[PDB]
Amino acid sequence: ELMPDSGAVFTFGKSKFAENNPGKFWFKNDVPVHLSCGDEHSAVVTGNNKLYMFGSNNWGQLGLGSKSAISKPTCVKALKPEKVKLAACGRNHTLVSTEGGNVYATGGNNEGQLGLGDTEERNTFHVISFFTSEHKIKQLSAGSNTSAALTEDGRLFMWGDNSEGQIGLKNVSNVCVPQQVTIGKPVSWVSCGYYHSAFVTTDGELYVFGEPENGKLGLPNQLLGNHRTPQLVSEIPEKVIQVACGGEHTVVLTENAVYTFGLGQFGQLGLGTFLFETSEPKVIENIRDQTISYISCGENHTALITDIGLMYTFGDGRHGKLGLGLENFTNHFIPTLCSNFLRFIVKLVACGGCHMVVFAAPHR
Partner 1 sequence: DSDDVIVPPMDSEKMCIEIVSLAFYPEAEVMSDENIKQVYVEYKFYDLPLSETETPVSLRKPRAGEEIHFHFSKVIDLDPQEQQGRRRFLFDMLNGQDPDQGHLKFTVVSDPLDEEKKECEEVGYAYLQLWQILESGRDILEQELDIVSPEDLATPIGRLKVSLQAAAVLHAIYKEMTED
Q: Which stretch binds partner 1 (CB under 8 A): 150-158, 176-184, 254-262, 310-318?
A: 310-318
Question: Angle at the Cα of 151 (from 201 to 94), degrees rounded to 5?
Answer: 110
52 binds, among partner 1, Mg ion, none (CB under 5 to 8 A by kind): partner 1
CA–CA distance, 169 with 160 (Å, rounded to integer): 10
Q: How are beta strands 277-283 and 258-263 bridged, if at all?
A: antiparallel
Q: After which residues is the chain broken (C to N over 2.5 A)?
A: none
Nearest alpha carbon to residue 41 among 123, 116, 104, 97? 123
**What part of residues 286-315 is at the interface with Mg ion (CB under 5 A)?**
299
**Cα atoms in the 13 Å half-sphere on the side-chain side of 273:** 3
10 binds partner 1 (CB under 8 A): no
In whole angstroms, the minimum distance from the beta carbon of 222 to partner 1 comes to 25
CA–CA distance, 282 with 92 (Å, rounded to integer): 31
77 binds partner 1 (CB under 8 A): yes
21 binds, among Mg ion, partner 1, none (CB under 5 to 8 A by kind): partner 1
27 binds partner 1 (CB under 8 A): yes
In whole angstroms, the minimum distance from the beta carbon of 28 to partner 1 comes to 5
CA–CA distance, 342 with 75 (Å, rounded to integer): 30
* Nearest residue to Mg ion, scored by beta-carbon proximity: 353
23 binds partner 1 (CB under 8 A): yes
| 357, 10 contact by CB (below 8 A) | yes
353 binds Mg ion (CB under 5 A): yes
In whole angstroms, the minimum distance from the beta carbon of 184 to partner 1 comes to 42
Residue ranges in contact with partner 1 by CB under 8 A:
1, 3, 18, 21, 23-28, 50, 52, 72-73, 75, 77, 80, 265-266, 273-274, 276, 316-318, 327-333
Residue ranges in contact with Mg ion by CB under 5 A:
279, 299, 353
